[PDB]
Design an enzyme around this catalytic site. Structure first.
Site, PDB file in Angstrom:
ATOM      1  N   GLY K  57       6.751  -7.776  -1.919  1.00 12.86           N
ATOM      2  CA  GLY K  57       6.473  -9.189  -1.710  1.00 12.86           C
ATOM      3  C   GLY K  57       5.066  -9.561  -2.128  1.00 12.86           C
ATOM      4  CB  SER K  86       5.236  -3.341  -2.940  1.00 10.67           C
ATOM      5  OG  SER K  86       4.509  -4.541  -2.753  1.00 10.67           O
ATOM      6  CG  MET K  87       3.150  -6.686   0.271  1.00 10.19           C
ATOM      7  SD  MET K  87       1.499  -6.271   0.874  1.00 10.19           S
ATOM      8  CE  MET K  87       0.730  -5.649  -0.612  1.00 10.19           C
ATOM      9  CG  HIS K 111       2.787   1.400  -8.588  1.00 10.16           C
ATOM     10  ND1 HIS K 111       3.840   0.735  -9.177  1.00 10.16           N
ATOM     11  CD2 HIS K 111       1.750   1.297  -9.450  1.00 10.16           C
ATOM     12  CE1 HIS K 111       3.450   0.236 -10.335  1.00 10.16           C
ATOM     13  NE2 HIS K 111       2.186   0.564 -10.525  1.00 10.16           N
ATOM     14  CG  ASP K 148       6.305   2.500 -11.876  1.00 10.66           C
ATOM     15  OD1 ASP K 148       7.194   2.744 -11.040  1.00 10.66           O
ATOM     16  OD2 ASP K 148       6.246   1.424 -12.502  1.00 10.66           O
TER      17      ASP K 148
END
Lengths: 165, 165, 165, 165, 165, 165, 165, 165, 165, 165, 165, 165
Positions: K57, K86-87, K111, K148
């Site tokens: 997000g 991510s978040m 990442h 990644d």
């Protein structure tokens, strides 16, 4: 649009013929004004022929076209095919005296289907132009421009919009 | 657009005529600037004719066009057909003295229908240009630019926007 | 559309052939009127051939085309391929006497699939035109224009719409 | 829409009030007819109140509503707020004699902004209804239904559309 | 839709009233069939009332509704408000003898505005149903179903579609 | 776009003039780079003229155009007409020393209206280019790149972006 | 959808009635399967009634519904109202023997209007189910599944799809 | 479409080749009819070649094309590449006897995937044309026109649609 | 796109220059392959120049272009302007040894922003090509192709992607 | 969705039944996980029933649902109705041993119709789960997951996906 | 969403369970913050449970949620089902020490797939938060946040994101 | 598309080169067939070259193209660049023996990613064509056409699809 590299409209314009068909708006007015200016630059003595088949349009564009027709020195003949309503009837009546013609099955309408004051000024301008070119009184023009109806070429001939049919 | 391989607008440009019709924005400004530059490169002594029929536009494009007209050395004649409102009235008033003309049924409007400071700077620029080219005082220009109304060619003649009608 | 720089329709127009295909509206009417005028200016004695394959259209455009066909001095032959319905049947019946032809598998329909008074006037105009060109009585025309059905070339021959098949 | 589980319109309907606002079409006609039928089933002696603010609509829906109002046995009061134009003016004039009211700043219009014969039959039906409820002659109704203009409550009172203002 | 938690249509259905408004298609047919079945399960002796205001629809849905009305044992009254055209006229004529009513300003139309054989079989089914319920001959029904026109309640009374008006 | 088979832009390119108008993105950058390469192949000694009227664009495209401008051996003159903001100001300042011009009513803005490290790297690249071509210190450039405001040609002359006005 | 807080369909489901209307797809199949499971959990001895009015659908959903119908222990009655085509005819024929009914004006069609092998396996599955429930031979089923036509209730009675009409 | 100023289709038309690909509708029919007329005007003795790859189309357009093919005096050869289904199979079978050819991997279908009476008349017209050109009986044609299946070139040879493969 | 009847890109192709700008997909790959084939047919000894400004694209198209560049016998020079990311970096590194150039402000990225096994095979193909043309080990290539970052021309020179800057 | 204030799905959930119908994505996975958690909180000893009719979905959502089913302590029965393809077959095979059922006309497919390495890891995860729950070897699973075909309940019984049918 | 008038999510919230599923943006952040505040007002001593299944997000919303979780006095347990990328990984690692759990088939990504300076400040904020809650060094966090790739629960256990699996 | 008035594809066609790129459908098939016919009419002895880069297409169009290639008398060479999947692999294998070539990084797929019987007949046609041109057995072709995988040029050489690489 069939071609003759000329198109059919350009081939017609070679014969000094301007076609005013469909609704009249700013783009149509600009094209017609440019065509009239080009025709005048080609010659300022030869006649021009206009064919009108139009349901109406905007007042400003019609007034611009009327002013351009009245500016140039060439005689102009106007021919109604099909329809001449609202702004098209102004152009039909604005031709050279004795050179305003119509086909037997044509309908003519002079009724009209910014701030509150500019609209009134434009309407009074229209009344004055119509009274000048038709030879009616102003009151007759205001009364006639209110009824929602069409006219036959004989009625328009009696009114003063046409010369022959 | 009828052709003459030239179009009607290119045929007109052969006669040194630039047409400014419709709303003025960045694309229109770029085309007009390119046309003026090409006309100047053809000759820097011959006059140019501009025909204006415009409802207005953006301030930046109008200022660019005004600067380009003031840069080149050719005399420029401006003719109002139809409408000259907002940015079009600036171009109409910016022509060469004694060469600003209008048609009898034309309406002229000088009222205008980023951050908060750039807009005010551009407005002060407009006030200064108008006062320079019209020979009014600044206060008169600011007062007149606030009322929402149009003008007739005789009123614009009295103001200082036109020379003849 | 295959080319011959001429297109197939322009190559056909070189042979004095006007094609009326698809629904009839104002744009189609304007193109057909311009083509007929150009053909007449080429010569006012040579015949013209029209091929009709049309499901119908608007009354005003059909009346304009009919008036233009009746105006020019050239003989006109009409040929039905496929369909001639509503407005196309008027054009088919409006050709020169003895020059109205159809193909064996063609269908002809004269039934028709502003304010309340103009529609009545246009309908009475249609009744009068049909009665004039078909040699029927008015009552027969109004009765026949009410039933929703098609006709074969032999029925249209008996009615008076065609001359040969 | 604020609530009172009742909504504001349902709370008003509890007071025997039917609201006819916006353009009149088939859905609006069905809802109004159902409301009138339910109100009659609640009681066939108590009065009903209708508030009209409408720009017009379709002829068939207005005729259906008019027939339903004339069918039930309850007295009906009609009140004009804002606009009553085209079909709304029929409903305004169709109320019980002595129970047709308007507000001082209201505008009333009776001009009207399938096949060709059904439209004429419906128009003749409208003429007869208007002449019956207004007490004018038929010729007066046809003449007045052609001019494109609005009326003030005093003019509508003189005509026969209203009783008080 | 105003409420009374009941809506206006549910409040009406409490009084044994089914409303058939708008075009008739599969969803409308399913809802009407479900309502009729529920009403029959509530009681198989009490009458039912139907109000029709419909421009037409699909043949299959109308045939399904007609079959459902003919299946249940309850008497059914049919009332025309506004319009009864195409498939709605079948429902209007299919009510119980002596219980088919119309309002004075109503229009009734029986003309109709898969593979090629199923359509013809459905049309023959319609002819047989109409002849059974109207007491006309088959040839009269086929002739009348071809003309594009509406009928008044007195004409429909003479034909056999209605009982009273 | 008026023609002269050449267009107006191609006619201008015949005079060694590249026009950079509108927002700068990858397509515009590719066209400008191709034009510059073609002009260099025509001659590597003759000057080139660029006219800028641009609201900004993408950093990568502007950097590509700047690199191509610095690669070729021809002198380049830059002229601001209208607007030079964000990426356009880089191109304006990147011209040959003594050959950077502007019109009196022009606005110049150097403030700027992937992952988190590439953006910062490109920003440092911009700072270095601006400091090299303007002869300011890096801290002055980063301070000026943060305020949201435009500049007049005299302010841009004092800063170091222009040479004459 | 009128309410009785129950809707009309929920009120019908209170009477052990499942309605299969409209095209059959995955969502419809899931809803019908859930309804059948809930009805069985309410009681496993009481009969269930299904009303079919369907133009067809997907093979997988129809097969799922057929399997669920054959799984539960309750007797199931099937009633055709309107249409039973493609997948709906399978459901109509899959009811309990002696409990398959139709209305007099109903049409029944068994013709059907991934990789290349799964489609063949599903078709052979359909052939086997039809032959089992109709008591025809496989060749008769494959021949009849190819003609594009509908059937009357008497024809479907002779075939074996129905029990009574 | 690659060019040879001729296109590939125009280059083919130079060899007297008409290509009928894709669905057949009114525009395609008009183009094909115009091409056939132009080819006949070029010469009325030379053969013409048609290549068909079509999934079907509208009956009226196919009938128009068939009539035009039967009207002109030139021999016509028909070649099936890919598909000839519905209306394309009529065109394939309508070629000159002894000049109807197909490729080994081609599929031919004669099954067909306004009011209720015109469709029946058009279908009977198709039956008569097919029986005339194939030399079957009418009953055989009606039976074969009902099964949903394709044919191989050997099957179409046995039927009478082709001459060689 | 300015013209010189040649366009700017065609004028550049006259100098044996292929431009690879924008995202690489199947259409771009086909155009580039056709251009390379035509250039080779013109001469198989003369060098070719490619200019790359690309954000990336699809693996299959890039592999096709790489194979075509490796097939022809002409020397090929590659020049990076702006961006060379993902697939563009493969083309940049695939040029002739000693003929791979970049501009000082360019960014190079080799990280990459059907079934599950084909993707792995294509990735291993990319690893092998990169290791062959860069002279790194396979493990170094797989490690470097995972970090999300760009490179400067000096870093790409140290890696082995470029020869000069 | 018919109601019982409960819906049909909520009424089913009262019986400890979770329905997995339609494609499986993140929203469906979240709803199913929440339902399973709520059911476990109601009781951790009672069985749960799942009904699968699914064409497939995303791997991550299916893995999340599988993990949640394996986490809770309740026995779980799985029933295939209609389809169990791709991700739904994993859920079908992941039920409690001896409690995996299917209907006779059901199709089961285990073939499957970010960066390049995560897809490989997820595929190897799927292979391991399938081999654990089916008792096959890994090579058999990878071979079977490559062919594009469906299975009958008897084939799935022989493989190890089901326990009874 | 099945109901229990409570929904399934509200029924879960009755058990002090907050569900964070799908992408995290401003609306989701506001709802989660409101739920956490309401739960704290209910009691400031009882634990809370959060279930994360999220692809990522916006940074601002995640930082707001993290701040709210760190503000309240209740212990918080975090459970990963499916995805935490991510978040979502920040929220997973931000739970109470000893109360961070994951399911065996879960993937964790740290990442990350305005002006140029605010992005850098937010990134440094993220680095500091991650280093504080994971007990790594800052350089390790910056190196790991660039590759990644995803992680298994055992790798995340070794890193410091989880406590148990 | 760069020009040479010829385009790049027309310039290539001057060298007897047909390009089959992108998905194959009816329009592409018609263009390719027309190009092959034109090339044969130019000469029936000279070779033709085809370049294939295609993801697949429709079976009917590919069969039409295959039949046209087998009809003409010219030798045909086939070259795979990029992709040859589904229908493109048929065209690749259908070239003249000894004249089927591929590039080293090309992928070849023969798996394929109306009513139920026509699809099966077309599939059997494909099996027969593949077995004829590859020299495999029918069972081998059916087995290989089921696995979802690609092939390298060496595998396709061993199978029989290519001659050289």
């Amino acid at each position: 649009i069939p071609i003759v590299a000329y198109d059919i409209y350009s081939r017609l314009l070679r014969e000094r013929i301007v076609c005013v068909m469909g609704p009249i708006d700013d783009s149509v007015a600009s094209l017609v004004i440019a065509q009239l200016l080009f025709l005048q630059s080609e010659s300022n003595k030869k006649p021009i022929h206009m064919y009108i088949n139009s349901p109406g349009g905007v007042v400003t564009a019609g007034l611009a076209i009327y002013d351009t027709m009245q500016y140039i020195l060439n005689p102009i003949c106007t021919w109604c095919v099909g329809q001449a309503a609202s702004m098209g009837s102004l152009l039909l009546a604005a031709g050279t005296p004795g050179m305003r013609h119509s086909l037997p099955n044509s309908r003519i309408m002079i009724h009209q289907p910014i701030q509150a004051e500019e609209i009134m000024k434009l309407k009074k301008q229209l009344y004055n132009i119509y009274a000048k070119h038709t030879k009616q009184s102003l009151q007759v023009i205001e009364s006639a421009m209110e009824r929602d109806r069409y006219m036959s070429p004989m009625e328009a001939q009696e009114f003063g919009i046409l010369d022959k049919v």
